[PDB]
Amino acid sequence: GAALAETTSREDFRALATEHRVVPVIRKVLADSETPLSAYRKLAANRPGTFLLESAEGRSWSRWSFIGAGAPSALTVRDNAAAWLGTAPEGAPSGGDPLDALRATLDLLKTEAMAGLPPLSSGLVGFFAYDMVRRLERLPELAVDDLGLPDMLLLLATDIAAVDHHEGTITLIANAVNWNGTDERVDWAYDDAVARLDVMTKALGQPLTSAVATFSRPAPDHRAQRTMEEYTEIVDKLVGDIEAGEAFQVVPSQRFEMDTAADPLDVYRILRVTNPSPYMYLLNIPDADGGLDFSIVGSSPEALVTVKDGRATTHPIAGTRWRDVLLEKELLADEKEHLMLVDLGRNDLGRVCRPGTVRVDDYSHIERYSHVMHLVSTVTGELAEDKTALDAVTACFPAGTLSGAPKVRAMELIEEVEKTRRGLYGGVVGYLDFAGNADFAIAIRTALMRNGTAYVQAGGGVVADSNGPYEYTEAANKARAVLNAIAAAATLAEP
């Protein structure tokens, strides 16, 4: 009767637009011969301003994957001020402090949750660099900024494809965004969104060449910033501070790099098959001319904070094992510090949540993924009425597991011992939606790919009993998870 792919009607759109800043025009299609990756290849074609977000659950892949089909606009930092790349939307906040411009943007577009939509239907998708913390806390300026990344870059994801693995369907969404709050051009906005659905629908109609492949796992030819001896000097320095009482924990790191001609999407494919995680992402970041500035590809196992319907939640990980029930109780029985970070998170959420709503849940459960298992503690709370999801992000930022405790003192020492500004490393990758929700991964196990070079940073917590060579090795192993994927992706070939 009604067709599966019936598009939101002009009449229904009109009625919503009288009440809502961001109105989705949607169309569902049967896509039972597509995967999230094949849909990405058709809809995004690896273009600048596109994205793919996937999530392993402990039941394999979650129901939904999200493709950003191509954002004409992105909110970033240029010459120390908020700026839009691509189209600067008329009436959208610009200039001045970037966090204020972002806050103003989210306030302007705040839209009531609507029933019948996929979990993410519009939003700002991208990253905060670790160095955004420099705007939340005063920190020295010693490390060299050789990567030149912006403190933030958020794609205005108005064209989204939501892939429903269970149903074998894709819900295409093209949002109308009412920046100025007028009623003047409702029909134009509907026709505009419908045209964008038609572009995505036509893209899905194209044939696709095979990507059925083999790959091998060669050693990555890569360079490191620190030798084992140099990293050992760092670790020993920090163990001194910890013994003298300056901090309880500090997380140093270093950066690794390798030459690669591999496509970022192929790197994503190797990470997906090798290191499936709750936060898989590929982001193609545009430069100011509409070309590709760089790509971010990562498989992060840990969130910073998730905000859903007023509730903020964090899952700091105590420990992890290689995945069988004896590895489990072997981790609950590790009394080897976790709860100092659970303490940091209790404080962090307390600053944005209603009094008494912040609950902790010591070692609440394990999380079994495909090739690993995690022991997590849960901290949740209810956001105050004058606090947004963005406030939750800034309150928690950066992860304590990526800085130390006390956080500010830990970050001061980090700045002292490291060579270069971290850039993305230890920041976050994720989204803020227009309904006030957010989900951000800690930016670890991530490559930054730019003009034939891949950068991979990794580190690890240093305490009083820490050994330099052991910590060097642990951190290099974390980096090698990504470097190995890049090396392997270069070998992809037809079988």
Place this chain on the structure above:
Amino acid sequence: AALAETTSREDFRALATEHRVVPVIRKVLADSETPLSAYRKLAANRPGTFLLESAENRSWSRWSFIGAGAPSALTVRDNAAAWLGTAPEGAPSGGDPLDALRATLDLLKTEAMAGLPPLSSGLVGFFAYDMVRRLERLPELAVDDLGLPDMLLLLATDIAAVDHHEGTITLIANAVNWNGTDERVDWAYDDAVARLDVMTKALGQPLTSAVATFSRPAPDHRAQRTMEEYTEIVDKLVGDIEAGEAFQVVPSQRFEMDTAADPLDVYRILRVTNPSPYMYLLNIPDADGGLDFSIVGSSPEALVTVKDGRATTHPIAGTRWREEDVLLEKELLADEKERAEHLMLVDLGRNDLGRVCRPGTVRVDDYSHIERYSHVMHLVSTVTGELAEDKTALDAVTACFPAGTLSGAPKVRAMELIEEVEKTRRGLYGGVVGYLDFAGNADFAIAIRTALMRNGTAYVQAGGGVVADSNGPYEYTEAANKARAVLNAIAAAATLAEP
């Protein structure tokens, strides 16, 4: 080393000295393929191909299975076991089909090997309901107008196992050693590698889009019985139950419709509309290697599953449509209208597994748990036992066959009464669709919510249990609505189009 490294000749040789069925395998990254796209590339609706998928208690299970094309099938011709296509040298044929099948499984029995997908070789296909006539003496009153064979099992030697979590496909080409000699080991290896290369080449091809819309028009269909005719049957059976002939009996009737739809398109509509633990598409070959007919279905209920010497059945007590979901669960748990009917079937399952299991191992868990799928939830019981040392998976299938759910209690009297009231032989309806693997395992769905598609006609049969308090009009409509689930899918499939 390489992901797609093929089983080496030297490893194959070593295995071939101990094992009758030896897989040569090759795993590939196939993260832009789905089970349906892989089926379209590998099998392409050819005769002798199949697709098996399973929703799990609340996604698709890890593995989907494609039978990429079986040259050989074991069936029935002129009332005796016979192979279609290639009759393998030394393979059992003639006589009773269940004997020939038992002899085939005996010959090919091969230890489960580490590192393989869950189904790596076996016999895939169906038993018609009317196979029961070789197990029990029943009257011959109903007309056999479909002409189906009592069984047809594809010898599935070329399989593609699709791993949804990894995004990989494990291609398997089995070498089958019928005579047990080592004469032709290198030829067997080369033949398997060649089969792997055919499947690999097929996966390397481009593929046109299948992104689609469809609508849901009412199906133009025909029935055997009107409501009043069906009521006469129900009233007759209620009388037999009141008289003590039986506790419950499951009549049915056949529906049909014209269709030019591709059976895979029917499959696709069933898949998106009601994913079930047993989805299947089987393209059944005729004796000349053309397509005899296709079987497409989404059955919710197993006959029996045999894994590692343990036989289990899960009779469904009730179903609900899916926090308002918590209330439906509560309601489902508290609904007792059909409890006695369900417990009678649990009792039959105990009878059945008792015949093949080691005394003291048959365990019954009344109303053991709820199974949660995308659009429905099932309240189920469990009957399980350990097979006796002299009993095989096939003995468990035959002991359970046909399902009490599709016959009645006591089973033989119920089948006699079915034969008295139905117009036509059931054919596939009330039989099973599934597999027996070469390692002694089995998993069979009851053949319900299934279409048989042949030469532009689709047949869909459906029925339901009659008990002392049943009424004709209600039971007619409940069974007609079961059939309509499939007829509706067929009518919708004809509308599939580019959006």
